[PDB]
Design a protein around this ligand. Sequence first.
Ligand code: GTP
Ligand code: GTP
Ligand code: CA
Ligand code: CA
Ligand code: MG
Ligand code: MG
Lengths: 440, 422, 61
Amino acid sequence: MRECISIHVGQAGVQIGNACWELYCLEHGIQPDGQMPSDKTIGGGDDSFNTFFSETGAGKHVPRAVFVDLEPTVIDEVRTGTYRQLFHPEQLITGKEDAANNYARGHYTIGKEIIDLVLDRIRKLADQCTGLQGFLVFHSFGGGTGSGFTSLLMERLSVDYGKKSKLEFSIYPAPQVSTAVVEPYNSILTTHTTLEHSDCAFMVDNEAIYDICRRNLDIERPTYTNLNRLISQIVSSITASLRFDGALNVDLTEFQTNLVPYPRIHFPLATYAPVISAEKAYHEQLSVAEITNACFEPANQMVKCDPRHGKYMACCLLYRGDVVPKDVNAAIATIKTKRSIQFVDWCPTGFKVGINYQPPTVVPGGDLAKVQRAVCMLSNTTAIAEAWARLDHKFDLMYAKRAFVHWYVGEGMEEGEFSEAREDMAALEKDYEEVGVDSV
Amino acid sequence: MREIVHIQAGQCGNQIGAKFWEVISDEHGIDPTGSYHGDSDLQLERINVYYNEAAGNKYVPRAILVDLEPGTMDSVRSGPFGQIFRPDNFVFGQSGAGNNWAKGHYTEGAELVDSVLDVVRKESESCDCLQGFQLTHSLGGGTGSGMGTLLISKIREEYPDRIMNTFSVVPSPKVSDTVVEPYNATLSVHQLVENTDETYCIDNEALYDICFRTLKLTTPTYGDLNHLVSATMSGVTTCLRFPGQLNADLRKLAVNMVPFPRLHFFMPGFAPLTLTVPELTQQMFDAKNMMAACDPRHGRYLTVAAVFRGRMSMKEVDEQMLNVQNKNSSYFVEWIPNNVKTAVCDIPPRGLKMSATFIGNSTAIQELFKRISEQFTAMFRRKAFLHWYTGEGMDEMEFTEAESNMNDLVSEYQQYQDATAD
Amino acid sequence: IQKAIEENNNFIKMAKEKLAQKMESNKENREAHLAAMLERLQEKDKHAEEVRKNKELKEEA
Ligand SMILES: Nc1nc2c(ncn2[C@@H]2O[C@H](COP(=O)(O)OP(=O)(O)OP(=O)(O)O)[C@@H](O)[C@H]2O)c(=O)[nH]1
Ligand SMILES: Nc1nc2c(ncn2[C@@H]2O[C@H](COP(=O)(O)OP(=O)(O)OP(=O)(O)O)[C@@H](O)[C@H]2O)c(=O)[nH]1
Ligand SMILES: [Ca+2]
Ligand SMILES: [Ca+2]
Ligand SMILES: [Mg+2]
Ligand SMILES: [Mg+2]
C-alpha cells in the first residue's frame, strides 16, 4: 500500500503515459505481456513497485492507470500496440468526438457525457487499493480535453475523494508544436479551475523540452516521440522514490512538504541532467558534481524562466544511480559559492536530497545516452511565474477583442468565467511577487 | 469515424464537385468502380471521412448530387467516376432556374429541397459520428446560389450543432456575362454570413487572371479554371483526409480560423502554379497565387493555415514560415498571437513532388466583397431586372438588406484591420 | 479533529455545489443559444412562405 493511481487525459496525457509506462516496465523488468519473472509473490505483494502496478493471479503486473480521451484514435493505438496486453480494456476509455481545442466542450458539452463512466473506472482501481495515497493526472493545458475535461475530473475527484492528494503533470504550450490559437484561453481556464483541487503540479514547457532535444540531442526537428521520451525520464525521476526503496531514498511526499509553502504556491520547477547523446556520452563519464552543476543551468529546465532573477523557497535534488552523499555534499558546497542562489528570508537554505540506487534506464532505439547517474532538481522559485506572465499576456491580447470567445459562449460559457479565471491568474502572479518580498 | 457529407448543387457545384471526387479518389487509391488499388495504408486510415464502405470492399462517395436542371445529372454519370456515385443520391428537377436566385431559393428550389433532405438524412443517420457538411456551388447562377443557400438553412435547422462548410464560386464578368450575377452573389452572401461556419471564396476573377497571366492561357476554359479549383480543394482537405495533427476536422479548423463568427470567408492559395521550400513558401504568400482576387498586402491576416505536401525538411519549413511572418510582421494582426499554423503531409498531390496550400482569413477579403457591391449597386441604383425577382414574390428590401449586411461585413473586416494591441 | 472533519466536509460540499450550479447554467446557456438559432431559422421559413404567397397573388392579375 500507498498506491498511486495515474490518470492520462487527452492526446498529450495519453502519449506521455505511453512513454512513462513503457519506461517503468523497463526499469522494473516487466514484460509487454505484464509478466515480471523477478516477482516471486504471485497475484499480490507489498513491494515498492506495487505502488504503481497491481498484480493478477496469473502473474500479470497491471498499471494502476486510466487513459481517457474524448476521441478514440490515440487510445486506439494503445489498444493495438506493443503494450496492449498490459491494460485491461476498461482502463482505456474513449468517446467519439473530441473537444475541438475548446475548454467548454471538454468541461461541459462533451465531457459531461463520459465523466460518470470515467469516475466509475477510477473507483474500480481505488477499490483494489489498500492505502491509496493519491492521483497523478497527466494532461496538456492547450487541448480542449486536457484543459476542460481534466478540470471537470479534478473537481469531481475532490468531491469523491476529499482532500486526498492530486498531483499534475501539465504540458505548457509552445508555438513550435502548438495545434490551436486558443491555447492561452484553455490554459488560463483550466489553471484557474483546478488550482483549488491540486496539491502539486509539475509544468512541462514544450518549448523547453523542444530546445533541449535540439541543443543537447541533435534532433533537427523534435517530434512528440522525442519530447515524450525525455518527459518520461523526468517523470520517472520524480516517481522513482515511490516505486523503489533504499536507505537514502526520500519519499516524494517529503519533498512536497518543503516544496509547497502555501496551497497556491505549488508549482515546482524541474531541471534534469544529463541529457546527452550516445555519440557524446562515449568515453565521457559525467560526475556527480557535473550533473549537479547542470541543474542550475537554465537551459536544462523544464520551464523557460530565469531563477537567477527570482528567489528560492526550496531546493530538492533527486539522484538516481551511482551516487553517494559525500559527493553530493561537495558538489552542493561548490555550487553555493559559484551560483546565483538567493533564498527568500523566511526559508531555510539547506538543499534536501534523495538518492535511489537503481540507475537510469533508456528505451531501445532512443536518443538519450544510458548513463550511470542522473539527477532531477525540484525547486520552488518565484521565477516560474514568468510562465504565467507569458501566457496571461497572450490571453490579454486576444480577450481585449474577444477573439474566438464566441466558440466558448456558444457551448454555454459566459464572459464572466474568462474574467474570473484571468483575475485568479493576476492574483497568482502577485502571490508569487509577495512571497519574494523580504520580511519586515 | 468523423464523416463529412458532401453536397454539390447546380452546374458549377456539380462540375467542380466531380473534379474534387476524381482528384481525391486518385489520391486515396479508389478507381471508378469503388475498389481500392493503392500502395499505402495511409490512404485508407481516414477514407471513411468522405467514403462509405459498401460490402464487396467497394467505397462510395458520401456525396449528394443536386440540380434543378436535369441535364447535369447525365453529364455527371458520363464523366470519369460517374459510376461511383450512389444512384439514389442523384436528386434532379426538370425546369431549371435561369440564373434567378429567387427561383432557386423560394420557388422551384423549395419544391425540390425536401427530396434532397431525405437523401441528406439518410446519409447522415448512417454516420458513426457526423462532423458536418461541405457544399460546392456558385453564387452567380440560380440553383447553386439560391437553392444551395436554401439547403444550408434547412440542413442547419436539423444539424444545428454540426459544421457547415462551403466552396463558393464568386462571379466575374471575365468569365460570365450574365448581368444578374451580382444580385445572385449578394443575395447568397447575405445567407452565407449568417449560416455557414467557414467558406472558401473560390473567385472566378482570380482563376481567370491566373490562367491568363501566369499559365499563359489566352482563352481559359472552365476546365482550366477548375484545374486550379481541384488542386485547391485537394489541398485544403488534406488535413481532413490523412492522419494529421492540425486542423484534422472541420470544427478544429473553424476554431483556429474564425475569431469572430461572421468573419469566416477564406482566401485560398496554391503553389506551385504551373522546387525549393523557400520558394514554395514565398509563392504561396504571393498575391498572384491567391484564388481570391485580393492583395493580402492591402489588409492584415487574422489567421492563416498553410499545408505543405511532399518529401521535404520540416526544419526548413519551420524556418521559412517563421521567416515570412517576421519579414511580413505588419500584415499579421498583433492581438492574435501565433495565428499562423502549419501542417506537413508526406503524400504529394499527383504530378508534383512538392506543393503548398494556403488558407488565409485576411481583412483584404473586403476587396472581393466591395467589387461585388460595386456591380450590385450599379444595377440596383436603377432597379434593373428586379422584376425577375419580385416576380417570384420577393420584396424590394430583401435586396436592400442583403446589400446592407454585406457592406456591414466589409466594415467589420475594416474594423479589425484598424485594431491595435495597445 | 472535529474542525478538520468539518472543513474537509465543507470543502467537499461547496465543490459539489459550485459544479452543480455551473453545469446547470451552462446547460441553460447552451440551450438558449441553440433555441435562438433555431428560432431565427424558423423565422426564415415563414418569410419564405410569405414570398410564395406573395407570388400566388401576382398570378391573380
Ligand atoms: N509533450 C507533448 N505535448 C503534446 C503531445 N500531444 C499534444 N501535445 C500538446 O498539447 C496541446 C494540444 O492539446 P491536446 O492534448 O493534443 O488535445 P486533447 O487533450 O486531445 O483535447 P482535444 O482538443 O479534445 O483534442 C498542444 O499545445 C501540443 O503542443 C505529446 O504527445 N507530447
Ligand atoms: N469556376 C467555375 N465556374 C463556373 C463553372 N460553371 C459555371 N460557373 C460559373 O457559375 C456562374 C453561374 O452559375 P451556374 O452554376 O452555371 O448556374 P446554376 O448554379 O446551375 O444555376 P442555374 O443555371 O440558374 O440553374 C457563372 O458566373 C459561371 O462563371 C465551372 O465549371 N467552374
Ligand atoms: Ca508480488
Ligand atoms: Ca505577406
Ligand atoms: Mg485530442
Ligand atoms: Mg444551370
